[model samples]
Target: VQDKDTLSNAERAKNVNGLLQVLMDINTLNGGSSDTADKIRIHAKNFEAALFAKSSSKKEYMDSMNEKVAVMRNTYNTRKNAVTA
Candidate 1:
């Protein structure tokens, strides 16, 4: 789960959705199917909608979003490449 104080609802949702998409793409490249990715993607989309409902602002969101993207990218690369090496 994400920390509520870390970002406004809108920002959290947007960032999560973006990360989820990236994850789904990676999952697919790693031989996972679209159905499996959709399951995870739905969770992210839901989170974004929930945040939008809460009426959050853009200023409160970008930092956390960027951080998450960076961390996830590193984690994905490390995990995915480790299998081949």
Candidate 2:
């Protein structure tokens, strides 16, 4: 993640949109569960917070979003196949 002081809100918002797309597509593989939608909303904020957070909170949120995105990607490919009824 880049330094919090260096990143802009617009950039963070853009990243949020992009990640939401990825998250929603992955969610579709599970029929777009309500839980997933809620989680997506929370994480959508994570990007901005990761940038808005202090040096410490920034790193924690950055790591959180990155880790979850990794899981979402991992879930996408495998579950998308299973969902291919």
Candidate 3:
């Protein structure tokens, strides 16, 4: 029914806002706390060891984040294009 479409779109919008807030919190946690830097560096070493990828420099970290967001945006565009009328 038409009601389902309306509710689903509303839920999707709400979910998007929720995810944005999560990303904001993630940035704050990762960037705001000096304590977290050392902790994350250890985690990053483990990550790099597992994935054979570099996360040592700022550009490398930003590139990894951007690649993830790019993949999400690509899928979003695909879904958006599938919508009709």
Candidate 4:
């Protein structure tokens, strides 16, 4: 995979897809309902839409993405522990 350019709109979309894929993968791995992944998917798309619209600074998107990623991991771990416990 090309890992050299990270400053383009194309790259941003690609990264978003990878992030959503991981969220979906984790939900399946933890044997949880698709609801969590779908939530994240929709949020990610909204973020992308805002990015495309240039409604906010890139830093704002950075913060939003960071928050969503943390939630994603926390949800995955919570479900995984619940399943295993």
From the highest lDDT down, the ranking of the candidates is 2, 4, 1, 3
> lDDT (CA) for every model shown?
0.57, 0.64, 0.42, 0.60
Candidate 1 has what TM-score? Answer: 0.48
Please estimate how well model 4 matches the true structure, expressed as its whole-model Cα lDDT.
0.60
Ranking by TM-score: 2, 4, 1, 3
lDDT for each residue of candidate 3 in 1-85, tens digit (9 for 90 to 100): 2333223345334433433343333433334455545534454344333322344444454455455445544554555456532
Clashes of each: 0, 0, 0, 0
Question: Which tens-of-lDDT digit does each residue in 1-85 have in candidate 1?
Answer: 2444454556555677686866564555463665746755774566455544443444324544455456656666777788768
The TM-scores, one per candidate, come to: 0.48, 0.55, 0.35, 0.53
State the lDDT of candidate 2 residue by residue for 25-75, as single tens digits.
687568456777776777666654553453345566466556656677678
Winner on lDDT (1 vs 2) = 2
- Writing each residue's lDDT as its tens digit, candidate 4 over 3-76 gives 23234677477648855765665666654556856765776677656544542455555555555566766777
Error of 2 at 80 (Å): 1.4
Inter-residue clash pairs, candidate 1: none
Worst 10-residue lDDT window, candidate 1:
52-61
Better of 3 and 4 by TM-score: 4
lDDT at 24, model 1? 61
Cα deviation at 71, candidate 1, in Å, is 2.8
lDDT of 3: 0.42
Off by over 4 Å in 4: 1-7, 10-14, 29-47, 50-55
